[PDB]
Amino acid sequence: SLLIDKTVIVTGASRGIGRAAARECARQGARVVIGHSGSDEGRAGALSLAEEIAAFGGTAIAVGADAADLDSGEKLVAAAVEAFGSVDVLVNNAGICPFHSFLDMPRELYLKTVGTNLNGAYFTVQAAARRMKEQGRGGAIIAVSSISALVGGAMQTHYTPTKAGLLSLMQSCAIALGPYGIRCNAVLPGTIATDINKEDLSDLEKRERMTSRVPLGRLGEPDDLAGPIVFLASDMARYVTGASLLVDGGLFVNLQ
Template identity: 85%
Template sequence: MLLAGKTVIITGASRGIGRAAAKECARQGARVVIGHSGSEQGTEAARSLIEEIAAFDGQAIEVGSDAADPDTGDRLVAGAVNAFGSVDVFVNNAGICPFHSFLDMPREVYLKTVNTNLNGAYFAVQAAANQMKNQGKGGAIIAVSSISALVGGGMQTHYTPTKAGLHSLMQSCAIALGPYGIRCNSVLPGTIATDINKDDLADEEKLAYMTSRTPLGRLGEPDDVAGPIVFLASDMAKYVTGASLLVDGGLFVNLQ
């Protein structure tokens, strides 16, 4: 029970990595706030996740609000405080990646990606950090960045800068928030099989290539990222801040 007594907010938690992280945090004793888009589909998925968590006596609530909205962080914090009395861990996981070529990138696709992945995240992290500061007990902030923060992608020119930005944000926030006992770290997943890349990985040739370049011999699953998130959220990582953890099956080192 590494997170017993802690309240954890996770954005983009109705599916993929966020959903796996929410379940594992709850298994480890956390009270979980499931952030999601607020759409009908997102609400339905979040409520089914609450049922899954309740099945093993975990506690969770859902808060629907677009990750691109600068006020979403305030809504998530308010939901956490009203339901559970505190915010101890904030996991910024929400993100989109609509693959598109660079030269004809629609302005609206670029702006939606940046607003969802980075701008909304900035203000959500700020809201969580202010709550943690006011509580006076420290806390942990974790950004789900990506291996894409470190390597380029021809169809991801709008996406990779946002993931590099999250990684950099955690480094700077580690300095800014360290005096308040708030630790800030990032996880950098490699190729994880989720909805965000299912169309891309439907290409059997690309799937075989990515698998062959991964030393562990398989693509990642959302559960593979949940454990590292729990570690960074827990007191086992009480002296870890400003760090980044690759969770990629060895893909990055094999791309050198």
């Protein structure tokens, strides 16, 4: 078990990658904080994860927090220190991807995605990093960006820069927090059959073409990101910081 006493903050853990990451952390011994949207969907799924975690002997807390609200980071660590006394791992997973054309992009739609995926993340890692610094025992930070941090997307001109900015954030934060033992890394998932990609997969017309492009012959599911995220949060990656890791089943390298 890899996080036997580390307490892990996972944002946007209602469903998708964030949910499966928080669950596997508890299975490795972590004391998870299940952050969510503060919506009733977020509140319900988080309790479900919290209830499922204690079902096999784990412990966790559900805390609502809007990633666009720049005060959510310090509230999430404040809930984590009040509940478990320390902040050791931050999985900044919260984000949105509203597909939209570029030349007619609304200013509000763009600024809501930059604030949620980038700006809100910047102050969640900041509030978390501070706690790891004055704790003096190090820590791990994992940002969930995208394969789109390395390529483009015609309907994601407002999305891919936030994901490439999350990667770059982990690169610079790796330098600023390096001397304090705080390693910062990014996971770049490929096509994960989640709710963000539901509108495309609900067509089931090019899902067969989506799967065709993945060399592993299948789409990703949230538990594909659980293993890599807890690896980056563990002592198995003690010398890993400023790195990205593609979790895409070969999608990136498979040129056609």
